[PDB]
Design an enzyme around this catalytic site. Structure first.
Site, mmCIF file in Angstrom:
data_model
loop_
_atom_site.group_PDB
_atom_site.id
_atom_site.type_symbol
_atom_site.label_atom_id
_atom_site.label_comp_id
_atom_site.label_asym_id
_atom_site.label_seq_id
_atom_site.Cartn_x
_atom_site.Cartn_y
_atom_site.Cartn_z
ATOM 1 N N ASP A 139 0.855 -1.195 0.000
ATOM 2 C CA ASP A 139 0.000 0.000 0.000
ATOM 3 C C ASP A 139 0.886 1.237 0.000
ATOM 4 O O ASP A 139 0.681 2.229 0.729
ATOM 5 C CB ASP A 139 -0.987 -0.011 1.173
ATOM 6 C CG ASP A 139 -2.171 0.992 1.002
ATOM 7 O OD1 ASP A 139 -2.415 1.479 -0.097
ATOM 8 O OD2 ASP A 139 -2.801 1.242 2.007
ATOM 9 N N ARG A 143 0.159 9.051 0.965
ATOM 10 C CA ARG A 143 -0.578 9.116 2.226
ATOM 11 C C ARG A 143 0.069 8.281 3.326
ATOM 12 O O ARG A 143 -0.230 8.476 4.501
ATOM 13 C CB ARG A 143 -2.038 8.636 2.016
ATOM 14 C CG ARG A 143 -2.178 7.180 1.620
ATOM 15 C CD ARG A 143 -3.687 6.714 1.347
ATOM 16 N NE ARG A 143 -3.630 5.384 0.697
ATOM 17 C CZ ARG A 143 -3.542 5.198 -0.615
ATOM 18 N NH1 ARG A 143 -3.574 6.209 -1.465
ATOM 19 N NH2 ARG A 143 -3.435 3.969 -1.100
ATOM 20 N N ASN A 144 0.898 7.300 2.961
ATOM 21 C CA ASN A 144 1.561 6.436 3.950
ATOM 22 C C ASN A 144 3.021 6.809 4.166
ATOM 23 O O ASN A 144 3.793 6.019 4.775
ATOM 24 C CB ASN A 144 1.430 4.978 3.513
ATOM 25 C CG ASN A 144 0.019 4.471 3.685
ATOM 26 O OD1 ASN A 144 -0.667 4.887 4.617
ATOM 27 N ND2 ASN A 144 -0.429 3.595 2.817
ATOM 28 N N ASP A 157 3.184 2.529 7.698
ATOM 29 C CA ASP A 157 2.079 1.600 7.428
ATOM 30 C C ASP A 157 2.486 0.146 7.202
ATOM 31 O O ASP A 157 2.590 -0.338 6.071
ATOM 32 C CB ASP A 157 1.149 2.079 6.294
ATOM 33 C CG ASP A 157 -0.073 1.199 6.137
ATOM 34 O OD1 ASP A 157 -0.803 1.075 7.139
ATOM 35 O OD2 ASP A 157 -0.276 0.609 5.033
#
Ligand SMILES: Cc1cccc(Cl)c1NC(=O)c1cnc(Nc2cc(C(=O)NC3CCNCC3)cc(-c3ccccc3N)c2)s1
Length: 295
Positions: A139, A143-144, A157
């Site tokens: 992922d 955003r991570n 993450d």
């Protein structure tokens, strides 16, 4: 044998401000007293509220256990956990500028090309380290990635579903949701084949997020429309003001055939060579005219 995870005593943790709130816990900025009372450092603190399920506990502590196995400048550092007292807590270094996607969206156009390329080199070094440790992130997305005061970007993450064999949640986010399609390589979407080479595809999408100051990949396209375009051979167009070499590298990350994509070591090496010969970054890819303005 795994690296030891420090159990922190609650008397050493103070929570100063809530910064995030979830249904199953919160994230705080706080301070951690360490070195037997002689040092104190700022930290982020994530809690797991009472009533959590066994799965939530194994996932929560599992993320800390994974983070604790890593020691790299571009990976978020774990200070330790509180598991013996409630609420349980995971304590990390505090990243003052938060998530990279939101940071860039609040800083539109404010950085140099060389700064953006430097951010990507750091992310690539963290991902090289992860892939070398046989960790597939699954992922990877801006955003991570978290950003500190000094503009250092660090990968975050992590979860047990990424490491355990035949894990039934391996194809979901660390929150049990669907992994957003538009960061994911085709063979991971269609066959569940997640590997470091699908993380390289994702890194190419992160490069495009960074060079556009946080634009949404593929703009208004729906998930099925993104799959349609990628499988037809469409790829994201160049960002504005983007070095030709940088756009070429992201395009190589998006090769349909996973064996043709660069390895993370190749990405780090190329970015390093561009930064050290910065005139190489002045050749820009053409920005495809989206609007006709004539006078
Ligand atoms: C504690 C922990 C446990 C497990 C996994 C991880 Cl990666 C962590 N560590 C962290 O979550 C964090 C470490 N540093 C962080 N920095 C941060 C920093 C800030 C924050 O102070 N950002 C600045 C506020 C003013 N605007 C510029 C950004 C905000 C968040 C944040 C957290 C939850 C929801 C929304 C947010 N904006 C986050 S979060």
């Amino acid at each position: 044998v795994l690296k030891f995870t420090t159990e922190i005593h609650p008397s050493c943790v103070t929570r100063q401000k809530v910064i995030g709130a979830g249904e199953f816990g919160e994230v705080y900025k706080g301070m951690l007293k360490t070195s037997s009372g002689k040092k104190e450092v700022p930290v982020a603190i994530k809690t797991l509220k009472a009533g959590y399920t066994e799965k939530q506990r194994v996932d929560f502590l599992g993320e800390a256990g994974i983070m604790g196995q890593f020691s790299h400048h571009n990976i978020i550092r774990l200070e330790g956990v509180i598991s013996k007292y409630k609420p349980m807590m995971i304590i990390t270094e505090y990243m003052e500028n938060g998530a990279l996607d939101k940071f860039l969206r609040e800083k539109d156009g404010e950085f140099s090309v060389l700064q953006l390329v430097g951010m990507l080199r750091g992310i690539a070094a963290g991902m090289k380290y992860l892939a070398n440790m046989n960790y597939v992130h699954r992922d990877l997305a801006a955003r991570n990635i978290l950003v500190n005061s000094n503009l250092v970007c660090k990968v975050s993450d992590f979860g047990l579903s990424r490491v355990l064999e035949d894990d039934p949640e391996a194809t979901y986010t660390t929150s049990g949701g669907k992994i957003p399609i538009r960061w994911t390589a085709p063979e991971a979407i269609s066959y569940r084949k997640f590997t470091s080479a699908s993380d390289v595809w994702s890194f190419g999408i992160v490069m495009w997020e960074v060079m556009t100051y946080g634009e949404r990949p593929y703009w208004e396209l729906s998930n099925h429309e993104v799959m349609k375009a990628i499988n037809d051979g469409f790829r994201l167009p160049t960002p504005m003001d983007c070095p030709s070499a940088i756009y070429q590298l992201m395009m190589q990350c998006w090769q349909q055939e996973r064996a043709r994509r660069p390895k993370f070591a190749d990405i780090v090496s190329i970015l390093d060579k561009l930064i050290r010969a910065p005139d190489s970054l002045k050749t820009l890819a053409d920005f495809d005219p989206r609007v006709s303005i004539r006078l």
